[PDB]
Enzyme design. Structure first.
Site, PDB file in Angstrom:
ATOM      1  CG  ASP A  40      26.324  32.858  -7.928  1.00  0.00           C
ATOM      2  OD1 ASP A  40      25.702  33.057  -9.026  1.00  0.00           O
ATOM      3  OD2 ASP A  40      27.557  32.558  -7.909  1.00  0.00           O
TER       4      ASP A  40
HETATM    5  O1  LIG Z   1      32.686  29.383  -2.298  1.00  0.00           O
HETATM    6  C1  LIG Z   1      31.527  30.067  -1.766  1.00  0.00           C
HETATM    7  C2  LIG Z   1      31.059  31.078  -2.780  1.00  0.00           C
HETATM    8  O2  LIG Z   1      30.924  30.469  -4.073  1.00  0.00           O
HETATM    9  C3  LIG Z   1      30.599  31.440  -5.034  1.00  0.00           C
HETATM   10  O3  LIG Z   1      30.634  30.773  -6.210  1.00  0.00           O
HETATM   11  C4  LIG Z   1      31.828  30.118  -6.956  1.00  0.00           C
HETATM   12  C5  LIG Z   1      32.634  31.221  -7.655  1.00  0.00           C
HETATM   13  O4  LIG Z   1      32.944  32.302  -6.719  1.00  0.00           O
HETATM   14  C6  LIG Z   1      33.835  30.545  -8.378  1.00  0.00           C
HETATM   15  O5  LIG Z   1      34.384  31.438  -9.263  1.00  0.00           O
HETATM   16  C7  LIG Z   1      33.360  29.261  -9.142  1.00  0.00           C
HETATM   17  C8  LIG Z   1      34.492  28.516  -9.768  1.00  0.00           C
HETATM   18  O6  LIG Z   1      35.430  28.096  -8.727  1.00  0.00           O
HETATM   19  O7  LIG Z   1      32.699  28.253  -8.222  1.00  0.00           O
HETATM   20  C9  LIG Z   1      31.515  28.822  -7.738  1.00  0.00           C
HETATM   21  O8  LIG Z   1      30.423  29.081  -8.736  1.00  0.00           O
HETATM   22  C10 LIG Z   1      29.216  31.974  -4.848  1.00  0.00           C
HETATM   23  O9  LIG Z   1      28.961  32.945  -5.798  1.00  0.00           O
HETATM   24  C11 LIG Z   1      29.102  32.599  -3.456  1.00  0.00           C
HETATM   25  O10 LIG Z   1      27.758  32.948  -3.148  1.00  0.00           O
HETATM   26  C12 LIG Z   1      29.680  31.715  -2.353  1.00  0.00           C
HETATM   27  O11 LIG Z   1      29.917  32.558  -1.214  1.00  0.00           O
HETATM   28  O1  LIG Z   2      26.615  36.407  -6.026  1.00  0.00           O
HETATM   29  C1  LIG Z   2      27.636  37.435  -6.426  1.00  0.00           C
HETATM   30  C2  LIG Z   2      28.953  36.875  -7.002  1.00  0.00           C
HETATM   31  C3  LIG Z   2      29.602  35.864  -6.070  1.00  0.00           C
HETATM   32  N1  LIG Z   2      30.878  35.255  -6.530  1.00  0.00           N
HETATM   33  C4  LIG Z   2      30.777  34.730  -7.891  1.00  0.00           C
HETATM   34  C5  LIG Z   2      30.219  35.759  -8.862  1.00  0.00           C
HETATM   35  O2  LIG Z   2      30.123  35.067 -10.109  1.00  0.00           O
HETATM   36  C6  LIG Z   2      28.815  36.207  -8.422  1.00  0.00           C
HETATM   37  O3  LIG Z   2      28.275  37.125  -9.380  1.00  0.00           O
END
Ligand SMILES: OC[C@H]1O[C@@H](O[C@@H]2[C@@H](O)[C@H](O)[C@@H](CO)O[C@@H]2O)[C@H](O)[C@@H](O)[C@@H]1O
Ligand SMILES: OC[C@H]1CNC[C@@H](O)[C@@H]1O
Length: 1113
Positions: free
Chosen positions: A760
């Site tokens: 992400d």
């Molecule tokens: O909260 C910071 C974090 O967000 C991450 O993304 C989310 C994910 O982990 C979660 O499953 C869904 C649904 O609640 O929301 C977001 O897409 C993201 O991957 C990280 O880079 C950030 O640290």
């Molecule tokens: O960026 C790496 C991961 C962070 N937390 C949500 C996952 O969907 C993602 O691949």
């Protein structure tokens, strides 16, 4: 009774700025044009996290006094944009004047009068620097992107901060410094100012010494400045200041706004500045932390201990045979993240659950935060935990105990014990032990608090509860009724304020002889400040309980007579045993340590995984509720497939396919899976593959091709409502596959990057990068997914299956033709056209500092897409460029960082903090590495890698790892680098173990579930297929003679491993000495395992359920 909302009564205003304060002058919300400046709202019992401290030095002492807020002894006067605090500290008279000017600039003007030899001032300010929504959603996350630049001005240190993560469209800014007095030292993080020791002492550690003058980019953005010391004889005057800008698109290079600051400093309001009433605490003392237990006491309360962690011969933590993890006080004072735990009620494991009750608690006396029923954001009774160090300690349920004349809030216990059903805190008092337990009930939507004096001694208590009854503290009015000892709480105007759960209610059963109030009982004149602090005073009791019920749909049930912890613990033990198919490793000799760590961790990871599924939230990542589309497709589905929870997976898949978006025909990034119609319709580029892969894995495991004929609706993009235009799941798949086919770069079967891949932090920085990048990882996943779909669909739609094979093969061809150079898979290809191509994250990208990427290396192997030569090369590249003592890293160098502006990747180039994916050891990716090693049969490397991320006795395994909570999953491992520049410069210390590494965010991750799958399916080698069992272990010699208990097709069996380098065949399985017939598995890297028919396996199991597995590495 209607509980009103807290409103800050001191409201200061000036152009484009509203700064509010609580009646003691504690910061509440400091807003400049939509940007919230402070990080934490003050509360009525603790005040706020910011302050100004006068220190007085004498020959035999150092003394420190807060000048502002409810802990100062200040009287207060206010005008429309000015506050004046007045008081004395020892025999110094002081005035502090707060000014809010029209310029988005404020001042704290300090005046001191008296006579003393040596004094100084410390300025202390927590900072958010984001929209109010971002700050409230996650302070830690916001801080990670807040980049501090340190300069010397006219008066020593000045701290300038740029928020690198876009706030709306804006990149907001702060500057803080001193005027008329030199700031001789500074710090930038709360961990530097307060220190871990605060969690016991309730005194900021920095107050005893000098600030370190280092910028620590962590999660508690907190500016401190220390003045030069001075004598006083007469009057001395000087100021601190702040500047907020809502948008500063450039990086910070120098002190700015010097002329504005000068103009602002001349600003004074014309209006009168009049006295206001300051309420004062009554018979409320400092917090109470338990004394530490010595070895004798520990031995007495916990006679049976396993996996004991010790540092300098002091016991930090251990596990018990009852499957508990116990943390001793000294450990909490050494972990940067606070020990904590999530409780969750049991549910029917054949269906997608609804109305699941959850609660969070922490070692330092946060007994119950974020009590929820169903939706973890909206369906909430108690406020969330925030921060890391418990400075603000009013959230959720808290306990005060009267010691001498004063109520004292419980904080840090002697010991904290977690089990999957509950938490217990042990507080050492004067000649007594107070035991507090917060536990989940089995089959009931309840959490229970029990307080017990061990010596049956009587005490007075106040139990406080920061109510929400909705998503946020202070947002809505609450309806509270009382019938005897039963309270009922619900939103006011439930239909309207809650269209979707109009019957949402909670109940609490409270002790017979208690009295009920708000925060008024804390104050001398009985003034209510916060009306939503529900306080229960319980006088002269040696025990009591509070039972908490949640009803998302108003199906109210009576309270039991007796609430017994032990019975719940026993029922949950069985539920968790069944959940992991009675997993248990044993040996006749000394069980190997690795096996012992797996037995201890398997139930803890199952719990974390089950939470990630059913009640989606974590410790740091409290804001979840939804399913991430790629998230639910990994951790939960892989976990459930591994353990034979097939009916559950079917239901997950149906729900998942119902959330495919009409028109675009991809998935949202995330969606609520309950009655709330909320999703994120914009998705990253890999997301579409995950539901396709998962349905194919489900079909292979079960043979249930019927799922393809289910009639299933879609959701509309904008309002996330059902479209009422159902189609078969097969057609859902066809439509999603068309979106993939339409991503081919012209002339090729290279799949365009679009909104990014798995990582992400790697979203493309512009539209050309979005259209013209190709992720080799995505390419590999696509190949894999389309091959899996081809097989799953072959029996049902012969033609579509042929088209799927063509796609998979063309994608495979483009992978080899474009994404590999000199035997190295490039992380990315940039292709504007056939004539303009450039590898990135590849050795040929000599301009860049980044030449290797992990993800394509592991995925290409997992998929058996990488030929043996390329796989073998991939592993050498990992060994030489990515492998560290704390695991394998995502790239061989950090992403760019040049002050916060993105060039190629978005958040990877914006994060100021070395953490999360920016750490480059994002544990999920390390787990895929394990999966790759298992695919290749590399048992030594695989089992070594398994252990490097196992939090049990981690510091013994990885000597440079700093200890962390041992019974919870950690999502990343980051070097102890204070900023991105040091991280880039001394990156190589990670490879050689010459920097310490510390754990990231806990619990909420696919990791636990995919780790469990590695253990069981890939390493222990027990996998399930349609009326078949696949046995394919990848074990080391030390597992020779070890046995796995595991329930297979409803029958408990015992798999005993023998590692035999002299065998002819790769594998042989025997029961009652009879060799089980079957077929060899397909594997291009090594000899495959064995496929044995279910009837054959079960028949043997009836005569003799001890299966002997002979395997040659
Ligand atoms: O909260 C910071 C974090 O967000 C991450 O993304 C989310 C994910 O982990 C979660 O499953 C869904 C649904 O609640 O929301 C977001 O897409 C993201 O991957 C990280 O880079 C950030 O640290
Ligand atoms: O960026 C790496 C991961 C962070 N937390 C949500 C996952 O969907 C993602 O691949």
């Amino acid at each position: 009774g209607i509980l009103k909302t807290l409103s800050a009564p001191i409201i200061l205003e000036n152009s484009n700025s509203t700064f509010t304060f609580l009646p003691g002058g504690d910061n509440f919300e400091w807003i400049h044009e939509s940007i919230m400046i402070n990080a934490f709202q003050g509360n009525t019992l603790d005040g706020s996290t910011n302050n100004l401290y006068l220190r007085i030095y004498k020959d035999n002492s150092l003394a420190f006094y807060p000048l502002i807020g409810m802990n100062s002894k200040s009287t207060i006067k206010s005008g429309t944009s000015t506050l004046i605090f007045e008081g004395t500290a020892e025999d110094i008279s002081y005035t502090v004047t707060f000014r809010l000017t029209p310029y988005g600039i404020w001042f704290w003007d300090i005046s001191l009068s008296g006579n003393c030899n040596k004094a100084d001032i410390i300025y202390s300010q927590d900072i958010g620097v984001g929209t109010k929504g971002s700050v409230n959603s996650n302070e830690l996350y916001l801080a990670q992107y807040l980049g501090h630049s340190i300069f010397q001005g006219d008066y020593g240190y000045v701290i300038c901060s740029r928020q690198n993560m876009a706030q709306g469209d804006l990149f907001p800014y702060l500057q803080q410094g001193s005027l008329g007095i030199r700031s001789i030292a500074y710090s930038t993080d709360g961990t530097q100012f307060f220190g871990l020791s605060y969690k016991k002492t309730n005194i900021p550690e920095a107050l005893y010494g000098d600030l370190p003058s280092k910028n620590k980019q962590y999660e508690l953005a907190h500016t401190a400045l220390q003045t030069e010391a001075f004598s006083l004889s007469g009057t001395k005057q000087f100021s601190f200041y702040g500047i907020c800008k809502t948008n500063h698109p450039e990086v910070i290079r120098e002190i700015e706004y010097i002329q504005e600051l000068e103009k602002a400093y001349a600003y004074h309001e014309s209006g009168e500045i009049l006295p206001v009433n300051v309420p004062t605490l009554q018979n409320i003392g400092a917090p109470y932390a338990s004394s530490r237990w010595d070895a004798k006491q520990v031995e007495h309360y916990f006679p049976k201990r396993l996996l004991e962690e010790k540092e300098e011969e002091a016991l930090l933590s251990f596990f018990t045979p009852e499957k508990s993890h116990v943390v001793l006080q000294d450990k909490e004072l050494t972990t940067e993240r606070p020990h904590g735990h999530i409780l969750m009620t049991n549910f029917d494991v054949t269906k997608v659950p609804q109305g699941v009750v959850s609660s969070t608690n922490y070692m330092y006396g946060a007994f119950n935060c974020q009590f929820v029923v169903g939706n973890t954001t909206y369906n909430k009774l108690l406020s969330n935990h925030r921060g890391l160090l418990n400075i603000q300690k009013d959230s959720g349920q808290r306990i005060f105990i009267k010691i001498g004349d004063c109520y004292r809030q419980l904080t840090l216990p002697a010991a904290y014990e977690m089990n999957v059903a509950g938490s217990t805190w042990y507080y050492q008092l004067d000649e007594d032990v107070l035991i507090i337990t917060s536990f989940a009930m089995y089959n009931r939507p309840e959490i229970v608090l029990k307080v017990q004096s061990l010596g049956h001694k009587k005490y007075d208590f106040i139990v406080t509860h920061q109510l929400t009854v909705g998503p946020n503290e202070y947002e809505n009015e609450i309806k509270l009724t009382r019938e005897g000892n039963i309270l009922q709480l619900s939103p006011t105007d439930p239909v309207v304020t809650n269209h979707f759960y109009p019957e949402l209610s909670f109940r609490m059963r409270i002790p017979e002889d208690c009295t009920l109030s708000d925060d008024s009982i804390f104050f001398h004149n009985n003034t209510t400040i916060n009306p939503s602090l529900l306080s229960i005073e319980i006088l002269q009791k040696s025990s009591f309980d509070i039972v908490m019920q949640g009803f998302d749909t108003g199906n109210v049930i009576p309270f039991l007579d007796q609430y017994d912890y032990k019975e719940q613990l026993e029922a949950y033990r069985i539920y968790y045993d069944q959940l992991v198919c009675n997993f248990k490793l044993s040996a006749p000799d000394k069980i190997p340590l690795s096996a012992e760590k797996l037995n201890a961790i398997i139930h803890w990871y199952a719990h974390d995984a089950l939470i990630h599924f059913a009640s989606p939230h974590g410790l740091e990542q409290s804001g979840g509720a939804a399913w991430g589309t790629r998230d639910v497709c990994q951790g939960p589905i892989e976990f459930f497939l591994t353990t034979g929870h097939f009916d559950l997976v079917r239901h997950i898949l149906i729900t998942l396919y119902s959330h495919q978006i009409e028109g675009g025909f991809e998935w949202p990034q995330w969606f609520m899976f309950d009655h709330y119609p909320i999703h994120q319709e914009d998705c990253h580029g890999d997301v579409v593959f995950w539901p396709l892969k998962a349905i194919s894995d489900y079909i292979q495991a079960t043979g249930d091709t019927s799922i393809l004929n289910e009639l299933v609706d879609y959701r509309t993009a904008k309002d996330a409502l059902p479209t009422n235009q159902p189609e078969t799941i097969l057609i859902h798949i066809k439509r999603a596959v068309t979106t993939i086919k339409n991503r081919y770069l012209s002339g090729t079967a290279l799949i365009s990057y679009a909104g990014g891949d798995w990582d992400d932090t790697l979203q493309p920085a512009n539209s050309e990068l979005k259209e013209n990048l190709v992720s080799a990882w995505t390419q590999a996943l696509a190949e894999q997914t389309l091959e899996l779909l081809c097989s799953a669909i072959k029996g049902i739609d012969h033609d579509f299956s042929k088209e799927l094979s063509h796609m998979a093969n063309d994608i495979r061809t483009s992978f080899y033709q474009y994404l590999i150079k000199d035997g190295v898979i490039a992380g990315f290809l940039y292709r504007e056209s056939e004539e303009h191509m450039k590898y990135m994250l590849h050795p040929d990208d000599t301009e860049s500092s980044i030449h290797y990427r992990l993800l394509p290396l592991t995925r290409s192997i997992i998929a058996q897409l990488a030929d043996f030569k390329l796989a073998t090369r991939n592993l050498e590249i990992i060994d030489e460029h990515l492998a560290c003592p704390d695991g394998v890293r995502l790239m061989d160098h950090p992403a760019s960082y040049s002050g916060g502006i993105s060039k190629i990747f978005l958040r990877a180039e914006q994060a100021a903090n070395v953490g999360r994916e920016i750490s480059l050891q994002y544990v999920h990716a390390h787990i895929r590495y394990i999966e790759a090693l298992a695919t290749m049969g590399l048992s030594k490397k695989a089992w070594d890698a398994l252990m490097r991320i196992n939090p049990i006795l981690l510091t013994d395994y990885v000597p440079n790892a700093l200890t962390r909570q041992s019974n919870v999953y950690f999502s990343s491992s980051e070097g102890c680098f204070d900023d991105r520049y040091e991280y880039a410069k001394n990156f190589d210390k990670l490879r050689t173990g010459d920097i310490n590494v510390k754990g990231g965010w806990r619990l909420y991750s696919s990791g636990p579930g995919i780790y469990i799958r590695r253990i069981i399916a890939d390493l222990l080698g027990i996998r399930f297929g349609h009326n078949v069992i696949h046995i394919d272990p990848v074990v080391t010699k030390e597992l020779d003679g070890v046995t796995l208990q595991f329930t297979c097709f409803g029958k408990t069996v015992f798999f005993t491993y023998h590692v035999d380098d002299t065998m002819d065949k790769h594998i042989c399985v025997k029961s009652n000495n009879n060799i089980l017939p079957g077929d060899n598995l397909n594997n291009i890297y090594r000899d495959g395992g064995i496929q044995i028919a279910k009837d054959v396996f079960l028949s043997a199991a009836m005569s003799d359920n001890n299966f002997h597995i002979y395997v040659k590495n």
